[PDB]
Design a protein around this ligand. Sequence first.
Ligand SMILES: [Co+2]
Ligand SMILES: [Co+2]
Ligand SMILES: [Co+2]
Ligand SMILES: [Co+2]
Ligand SMILES: [Os+3]
Ligand SMILES: [Os+3]
Ligand SMILES: [Os+3]
Ligand SMILES: [Os+3]
Ligand SMILES: [Os+3]
Ligand SMILES: [Os+3]
Ligand SMILES: [Os+3]
Ligand SMILES: [Os+3]
Lengths: 208, 208, 209, 209
Amino acid sequence: PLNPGTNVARLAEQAPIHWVSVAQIENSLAGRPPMAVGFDIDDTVLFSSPGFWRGKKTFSPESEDYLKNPVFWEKMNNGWDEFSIPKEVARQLIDMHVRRGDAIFFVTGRSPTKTETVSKTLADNFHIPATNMNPVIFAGDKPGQNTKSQWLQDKNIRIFYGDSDNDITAARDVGARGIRILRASNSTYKPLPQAGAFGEEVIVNSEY
Amino acid sequence: PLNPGTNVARLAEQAPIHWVSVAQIENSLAGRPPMAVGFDIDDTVLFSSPGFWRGKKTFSPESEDYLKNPVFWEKMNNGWDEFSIPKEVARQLIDMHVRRGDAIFFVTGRSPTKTETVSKTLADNFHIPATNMNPVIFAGDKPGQNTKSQWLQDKNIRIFYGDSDNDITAARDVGARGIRILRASNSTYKPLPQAGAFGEEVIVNSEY
Amino acid sequence: SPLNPGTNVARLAEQAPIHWVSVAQIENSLAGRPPMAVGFDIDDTVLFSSPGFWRGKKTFSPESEDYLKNPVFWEKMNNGWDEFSIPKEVARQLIDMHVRRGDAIFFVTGRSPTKTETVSKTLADNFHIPATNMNPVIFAGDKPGQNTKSQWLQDKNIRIFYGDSDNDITAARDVGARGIRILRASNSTYKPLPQAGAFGEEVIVNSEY
Amino acid sequence: SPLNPGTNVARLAEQAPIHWVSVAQIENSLAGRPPMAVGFDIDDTVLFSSPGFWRGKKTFSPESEDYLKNPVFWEKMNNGWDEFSIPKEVARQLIDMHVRRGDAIFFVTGRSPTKTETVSKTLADNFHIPATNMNPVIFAGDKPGQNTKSQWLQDKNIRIFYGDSDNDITAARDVGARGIRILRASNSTYKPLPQAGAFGEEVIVNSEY
Ligand SMILES: [Co+2]
Ligand SMILES: [Co+2]
Ligand SMILES: [Co+2]
Ligand SMILES: [Co+2]
Ligand SMILES: [Os+3]
Ligand SMILES: [Os+3]
Ligand SMILES: [Os+3]
Ligand SMILES: [Os+3]
Ligand SMILES: [Os+3]
Ligand SMILES: [Os+3]
Ligand SMILES: [Os+3]
Ligand SMILES: [Os+3]
């Protein structure tokens, strides 16, 4: 309607979400020794939509073809991340996990490429000391690869942060703590997921 | 779903409402001389649901019969308002209109009764000086009565505050400024109206 | 404060970190647990009883809170003024759920004891609680700085306690029960509103009505 | 700040007093008005151009804002880096609406002028603006404490100016145009976010994407 109107039941209404803060996560981990933790990349620690938007309009303006196009991946994984914007929620989590002496892992469904400069983009943006840093893991279901879940088990990752359903379920399938970050509403990756759909923790205000 | 989840498009989403504050209304009236203004009663200046809830379960537990039952009205209009809770938004508006030297009118669709102590309940709760106070007007469509709209025109009411659609349209039909107040979500008068449905001003936080 | 404060999208999306839950989530979390005792605070938890408290304030101590230790007030509040008290939908939903479960249902209130009380009847009637689930209201008092609820929750072996005030949640916590918060409506006369979620407790969504 | 801040229903329902509007409301408010000139700011109004600005910061002045008066930066920003700029849906909706109307569409930007610019092409392409509605981007500068937009809006007889920054709204107000606010996304690198609505101006709902 031209003027929908509203009411205070609607204005006050809350979805039943396990919201958490970075400070609550850290509190929850008080006294637990160094452990391995992992992050999804896209919309979790980098707003990488700039590179993906430019891939779609350079390589398949009318489809999602570009995501199976090696010319795109080679560009996305080798410097288009200089236009990716780091998420503040990720700065906060990564600083806290570095303070703990945790090992930091990035596990991505992006297609693998001959070389990648994503690892260095991350370590540089987030100031991750050498001793906490690990090369990006390209996970998936192509011949020769292992799944996200396998890599979590392989690396003994106890906490996995991610914005997509499959990040949470990959963690749950191996008994890790899967924590949800909100995808930004200006991402080009749509529809936005239903954060909290599995009763998982969701980080407040983690869209930026 | 057991865990609906949410996303930040939904968390940030706004209905396109002309929200206003009491301070903005007063600013809008800067330098305008004394004028007559009017208020709906129920859910506008009094949360009167306590009396109406007790009327429904005393007089028609299974219907809305009680609203045509004179035994109810006689009770509702003659002291059940001692359990009605005054709305803070109404305290703020009434104080400001008294400060302006405006005349205060209450125009109600409640059924008329032989006597009424509602006028005194209002003047007492809201501290309305004699010189600003006017006896409650019972408006409607029974033989001998005038409509809300007629009484607005008759009294030269230039601004009419109310929570129901018909308060806004009654004002609009006579060219008055109809300003919406939010019905509380715990009112027994349901469904809640769509505040802002006619592009009218709606007062922020006016549910209490 | 400023005439046109404006706002921004960080503020509009911002969420406090609260363990929000729904009645269905609570019911699921209890699936397969046999009958147990559970407990509810009354005022702003199951009944919007502000009508009677407001009337009492205005009748007996217009300029203060003395009415709340005035016996003549309590006698009115506990023997008919809850006829103006509006049942909360969250309470109807939770009480139906616990009856489904076969749980014993207690009401534990800091209202002062009176010679008679028709509050037990009002609650049983309003919420259609069967006799086997219903228990007489327990009137525990205030008494600063004691929580007069805790000992009742221990005595009745209450495993879940719903309430809108901080002391409802801490009473539960004192006894190892699961304290679950209901939001106090903004038009309550009991002010200021508590910070639901301030102990990391579950808070029921939309529970202000 | 506290580990479990909690919250309450006054806070959860609370609204700032903003003149929110929708594109449909704006279109209705213009029904029967003949073609006119209208204008848009670019950055965070029609394009999320933070990718290029972020890259520019990091390339040319990592520890400061000096890149924004560095010509080598502007030359990159205006000649290809908007290939990474993400069009805003609010902008697509508004620009389609103004084209429907037959309005002339201007882009007025405080980005610094460069020798060449492919920003006009990017916008025309991205938003499918026909040649008759499209106008070359107007690169006005910053220059504190001057608003370098106002004179352009007067020169082009722009009657509506959309923008996310306070100076977009005041430029409009300076010329008697109708200034309409778009929300800046919270993941913009241009911080802090402005207080949309702080001049009593219309603010477009959901306009952060
Ligand atoms: Co992702
Ligand atoms: Co009303
Ligand atoms: Co209570
Ligand atoms: Co801008
Ligand atoms: Os938790
Ligand atoms: Os990913
Ligand atoms: Os206005
Ligand atoms: Os009425
Ligand atoms: Os839970
Ligand atoms: Os109590
Ligand atoms: Os408007
Ligand atoms: Os600009």
